[PDB]
Structure formats: structure tokens, C-alpha cells
UniProtKB/Swiss-Prot annotation:
The active site is at D35, S199. It catalyses: Hydrolysis of proteins with specificity similar to that of pepsin A, prefers hydrophobic residues at P1 and P1', but does not cleave 14-Ala-|-Leu-15 in the B chain of insulin or Z-Glu-Tyr. Clots milk. It comes from Cryphonectria parasitica. The lineage of its organism: Eukaryota, Fungi, Dikarya, Ascomycota, Pezizomycotina. It is an enzyme of class 3 (hydrolase). Its EC number is 3.4.23.22. Disulfide bonds join C255-C290. Residues 17-328 form the Peptidase A1 domain. The chain holds residues 90 to 419 of 419 of the full protein. One of its GO terms (molecular function) is aspartic-type endopeptidase activity. This is Endothiapepsin. Keywords: Aspartyl protease, Disulfide bond, Hydrolase, Protease, Signal, Zymogen. GO terms for biological process: proteolysis. Belongs to the peptidase A1 family.
Length: 330
């Protein structure tokens, strides 16, 4: 089997991407944030505290004839951005772009943190990291991809995120028309439950490539590119008027400035992030100070190849017995 679904930016800055998912019988369609940095499929629901729902579409398990309470099960998650949610668990039929899993754990939110309430466009998350990170207790549950894997033509999914435009998540096949050149594959460590890999280096604009190992994660659920402070400093030094603002909480720059591209290495291959992908607009409405899309990972404890980086590539998440990641230009 295969599946293919379009993923759409939630706003004009590409802050996140939403993908429609069918849950239950008859289908209830929710727009979920596909997140290769986490491993829970959770949704706003009829069980979510009423004051914490503000425009989201909810899943109502009682209206699904295929929903079954996973008795005794609870879940609770906190994300790198300080946001959180928790609740109980149902199993139900979940379909993405034509690909159907029966018995998928659907984690129903009883509580969500403010950041989720305040974002009316995201109805929940669909985790695509490794199932070892799944928070369901007492019995850890599998991700949608893990459940689908054996049925797929090939045990892979691909992320093709758009810049200020829709893109595509495919399951079970590689669309050879969706990228240029070749796909370069690179090793993955699953020790922390992430799609963790090591970049071979970077360049700033037309500058020379610096060969240096950068360990980080391919995370579709993180907006920006978070890299070591040395790398980030070298980038912003090439933007006149850029500076790190402790009050804003990262590098900002005047939008009259021209942003250089940023290149990262995948083995001997090179992915070029155009300068425009690094502009995240005014820090506040009317401000001439713009927020940067490359920021320091210091104090995150891990480097994150978030949407800023991933949307410059066609990315293969290869779930073979030994997982690997593939990157192509596009």
C-alpha cells in the first residue's frame, strides 16, 4: 500500500504545516501537525476542557463506531517549546492520504497548554519519530508509520515541505519526479528516539564550505534551524545590522538587509537554504526588526534541522531494519 497527502502552511511565515487525517467511522477529518520529532498521535476532542478549545476541530470518540477505549491508558507530553498536553486513549481507524491503519492509538486530550489553545489551525499532532518515545502508559503505543510499515510497498515516508506553499507527505514510495539529482543517504542513530544524523558541515552564502560534524535531528515539528552558537554567529556576521537580542530571544535583523543562503552538508552532497527561507518577519506588527530563522541550539542540548532546513530538500525517512535518512535538492 501507499498514501499521499498534501501538507499546508498554517500561516504566511510557514510556522508549521497541517495535513488532513481521517479518524474513525464515519470519518472525522482533523488537521494534524506531522512531527518527526515526537511519537504521539494526539487530538483535540470532546473530552478536552471546554475553556481550552478555541476554534479547533475535535474528535468525538462516542460518534465513531470503530472507536474503543484503551482501558487504563493515559498519556502526557511536554515539548521542547515548553508546551504540553495529556489525556486518555482510544484505538480507532486512521487514514492519511488513502493509507489506512486499523487499531491506531488516538490519544484524546483532556488538557492542552495555552499555546495549543491559542493556535486555532492545529487540531493535534501525528508523531513520526520512533515509537520508543511514545508516552502512553502502562502500554506504550506505536506510531502511525510503525503500524503501517509492514503493509507499505517500501518501509519509508517522505517529507517535501513547501516554501510559502503546500507540499507533500508520502508513505510507502519515493516520487522520483519530486526532486532533482540524486538522493544522498546518511546514517541514523535511534538512541534518543529521533531521526538523528550527522551533517558534514556548512557554508554561508558564497563562502567556502567548513567541514565539521554537526549532530542533529530531522524535525518537521520544529519551525526553525537550531545549530551550534559558533555556526550561527558565523551566519549572522554576514548580515549587516544583525544582532542577538536577549529580550527577543535570538538573532534579529533589519529587513532592508539581504540574507545570504546557508548550505549544509549531507555526506559529500550539499543542500542550499535560500536566504529568503531564513526571514521570519517583524518581531511585532509594524517593527523594522525581523526575526531570524537560524538560531542557536545552546541550551536545547541538541541541534535541530527544523522546517527551515527540511523545506529546502526532499527528505526520505527510511524505516528499514537499519533506518537511514535521505536528502535531495529539489
Amino acid at each position: 500500500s501507499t498514501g499521499s497527502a498534501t501538507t499546508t502552511p498554517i500561516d504566511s511565515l510557514d510556522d508549521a504545516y497541517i495535513t488532513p487525517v481521517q479518524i474513525g467511522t464515519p470519518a472525522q477529518t482533523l488537521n494534524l501537525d506531522f512531527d518527526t520529532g515526537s511519537s504521539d498521535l494526539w487530538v483535540f476532542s470532546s473530552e478536552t476542557t471546554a475553556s481550552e478549545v478555541d476554534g479547533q476541530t475535535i474528535y468525538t470518540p462516542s460518534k465513531s463506531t470503530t472507536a474503543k477505549l484503551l482501558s487504563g491508558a493515559t498519556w502526557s507530553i511536554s515539548y521542547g517549546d515548553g508546551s504540553s498536553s495529556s489525556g486518555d486513549v482510544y484505538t480507532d481507524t486512521v487514514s492519511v492520504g488513502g493509507l489506512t491503519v486499523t487499531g491506531q492509538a488516538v490519544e484524546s486530550a483532556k488538557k492542552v497548554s495555552s499555546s495549543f489553545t491559542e493556535d486555532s489551525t492545529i487540531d493535534g499532532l501525528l508523531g513520526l519519530a520512533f515509537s520508543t518515545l511514545n508516552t502512553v502508559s502502562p502500554t506504550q503505543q506505536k506510531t502511525f508509520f510503525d503500524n503501517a510499515k509492514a503493509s507499505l510497498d517500501s518501509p519509508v515516508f517522505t517529507a517535501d515541505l513547501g516554501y510559502h506553499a503546500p507540499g507533500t507527505y508520502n508513505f510507502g514510495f519515493i516520487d522520483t519526479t519530486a526532486y532533482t539529482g540524486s538522493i544522498t543517504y546518511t546514517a541514523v542513530s535511534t538512541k534518543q528516539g529521533f531521526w538523528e544524523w550527522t551533517s558534514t558541515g556548512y557554508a554561508v552564502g558564497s563562502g567556502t564550505f567548513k567541514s565539521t560534524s554537526i549532530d542533529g535531528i530531522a524535525d518537521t515539528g520544529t519551525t526553525l534551524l537550531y545549530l551550534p552558537a559558533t555556526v550561527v554567529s558565523a551566519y549572522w556576521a554576514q548580515v549587516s545590522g544583525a544582532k542577538s537580542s536577549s529580550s527577543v530571544g535570538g538573532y534579529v535583523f533589519p529587513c532592508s538587509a539581504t540574507l545570504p543562503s546557508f548550505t549544509f552538508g549531507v555526506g559529500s552532497a550539499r543542500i542550499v537554504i535560500p536566504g529568503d527561507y531564513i526571514d521570519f518577519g517583524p518581531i511585532s506588527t509594524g517593527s523594522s526588526s525581523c526575526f531570524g530563522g537560524i538560531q542557536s541550539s545552546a541550551g536545547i542540548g541538541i541541534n535541530i534541522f527544523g522546517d527551515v532546513a527540511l523545506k529546502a530538500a526532499f527528505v526520505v525517512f527510511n524505516g528499514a531494519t537499519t533506518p537511514t535518512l535521505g536528502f535531495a535538492s529539489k
